[model samples]
Target: VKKLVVKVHMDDSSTKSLMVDERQLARDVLDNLFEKTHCDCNVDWCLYEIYPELQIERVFEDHENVVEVLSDWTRDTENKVLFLEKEERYAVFKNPQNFYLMNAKNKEYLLEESFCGTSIIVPELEGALYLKEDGKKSWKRRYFLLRASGIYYVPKGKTKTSRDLACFIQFENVNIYYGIQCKMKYKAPTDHCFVLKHPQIQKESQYIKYLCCDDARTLSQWVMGIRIAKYGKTLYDNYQRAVARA
Candidate 1:
């Protein structure tokens, strides 16, 4: 008998594969799954074929054969199946490529922008230390504030005070790097944790600026915050598109 390979997604945040005869009924597949895992939740669970393009699942009737259910459907390499509670309504799904890092409800709390004359200041985060180079000799700590368009800094003593436009870094084309490789190349201080690279005056030329955070969690937060601020609109647009498709 020919075998059919199917990927089974479970409710307990796990995934497994099962190979059954091509002529097996949906009931047979469910019985085999229970026999292997023995994770009977007591509740009536149903099997569904998950579609990546849309947030919907095709219900598999117990008596129906697996081959007949997947007929006429153009699926990706793997046959994805969802084992969920029978009464569950909407199948929440996401696009791995363009997933939103921040939640919609917390957008206002995370975002920070203020009007400053012609320039609309997009200040998102504050209190991170930026490595500033002076006279090509020494590096110093400069209080940094993250902005949507770019980054702005305030005097070390006046971190709580108004921001000065005199020192600003645009995020037009910039990249961030971590690890010891970037740390040693710039001869940055041991405490300086990450490096931010930007385009210089000439083409293909870049400028590296080091930055430090108090803790690993804070560092990760800053990295994610910067990305959200930079591509928030695009992220939201993608989210809306996914919603509409569903």
Candidate 2:
């Protein structure tokens, strides 16, 4: 006789304990929870396994087996199985308050009408921007050039030489962010700081570009130029729309 016991933490500091025969799907497990609690069978309920080691929570994908899911909580992981009432279209309510954007991951959650994920930049934005060093009050004035592929920085003694320009980062996954109050920490010459980061680079990482400017106008220029570089070319097909208009 194979029986498995599970405890699901619910609200009001309450946990529902139940036993299942052998194993069950995550969806079936939720079914039992629903029937046991006698709660409304709404489509918004979700079960999450709180991960202690990774400091992240994961939803029990419906099709996945509940036993194997629980089996993952090895030595370092003190996981909690939770029965949470998730808000359906949570991304829906989030977008409305976020000014039609997500802005959750450092302003990266905004929805896009973009059909093209990648395409080949122009209006090359080569100008002087104070780049923050990787480590070891890190600030230095550098000449940065924006190409169709990515942003490049002019190396020492390479003044305006395109061939010798060092590749800073690509524009595919890279996004420009307006840095707020970065001068105090980075010791930039100006208070205006613009950063290059990936959409998922949520909190912090070393794989980022921190470029400073003297004014917000240039900040917009750098950011808009960066956007135009990435979102460029693919938009010219709208020219065909113009041709249709013609």
| Highest lDDT scorer | 2
Q: TM-score for each prediction?
A: 0.40, 0.46
What are the Cα lDDT values of the candidates? 0.51, 0.60
Residue-by-residue lDDT tens digits, candidate 2, 14-129: 99887855567766787778778887765556676664432334344355567765654554446688887654212222332322213566333222322234543244456788
State in Å the error of residue 68, model 1: 44
Candidate 1 structure quality by residue, lDDT tens digits, 120-144: 3332467656464632424566767
The ten-residue window of minimal lDDT in model 2 covers 92-101
Clashing pairs in 2: 121-148
Highest TM-score model number: 2
Model 1: colliding residue pairs: none
Which portions of model 1 miss their true places by more than 4 Å? Answer: 1-124, 130-138, 156-159, 163-165, 190-192, 199-206, 238-246
Error of 1 at 34 (Å): 28
TM-score of 2: 0.46
